[PDB]
Symmetry: C3
Subunit: 116 residues, 3 copies
């Protein structure tokens, strides 16, 4: 239900809105979550502040953090890690090897929707 | 004690400084933490880069991650839940139901403050 | 493998590349990870947007998130805590008092 992507600053509006759609599209399908319950945001990392193996991109990648509450088994995570990863290689493209998808489970005692 | 609020790019300097005080005040009251211990950062997301349910805000939310050390019981989490939620629906307001709050407990073996962990203090 | 440092928007290119290198080098040594598997990014927070005990920096600091896969034992974490504390005082410099490191275990 919360997906943050850290990516390099090259991408255009269009790639952004299709990347949002896709992560959202890829999320509702795999884990069967509500579309209106899906939040995404992307984060432009400047080439001057993003390093692969110790040196900046400017001197020379896509990271996806998923925030679910814990109601998901390992198989439905395999599918999510799979679906999140595939559709981001489709639009706002990048090799599969260069996309990392992270799953952070939040205890229901630790996620607050409105007051509760 | 580590509070990142992800918000849209509208908010003025006043709203920011008031949002920072409010989340800090909310934290110290809720979890009885030292004010000196409370670091709060706001993350301004362009509308073109924030999606609600598949489409961007520009084509058409408040997300608060807290990284604390693990001591807090259920009730002091729920209060941290409501207190951060209320104070932010107060200043630089948005609807209650449009603010989401994430509580991440990092183990004492995994939190490093100065050179030392909290475990070896 | 994933190191996000949040910092104020004051630092030069040189401080930045030396920070990326110092975080990568402190990483590869301690936890013996592959340089090419070490990604590190810096997130500039403007002063109006970074608050300590309730006031904005401007009205008047480093937080380092490490996300590895979950095998790491206590000592390699405390060493990780220390390697990435120290080499961030060497360059993009700051008093140790004002740096927190955060270790996030992630492993399906």
């Amino acid at each position: 239900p919360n997906i943050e992507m850290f990516v390099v600053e090259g991408y255009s509006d269009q790639q952004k809105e299709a990347l949002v759609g896709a992560l959202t599209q890829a999320t509702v399908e795999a884990i069967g979550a509500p579309i209106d319950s899906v939040r995404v945001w992307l984060t432009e990392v400047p080439a001057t502040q993003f390093g692969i193996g110790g040196k900046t991109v400017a001197a020379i990648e896509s990271a996806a953090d998923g925030a679910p509450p814990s109601l998901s088994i390992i198989q439905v995570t395999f599918i999510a890690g799979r679906t999140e990863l595939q559709k981001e290689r489709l639009i706002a493209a990048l090799t599969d090897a260069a996309v990392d998808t992270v799953g952070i489970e939040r205890a229901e005692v630790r996620v607050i929707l409105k007051d509760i």
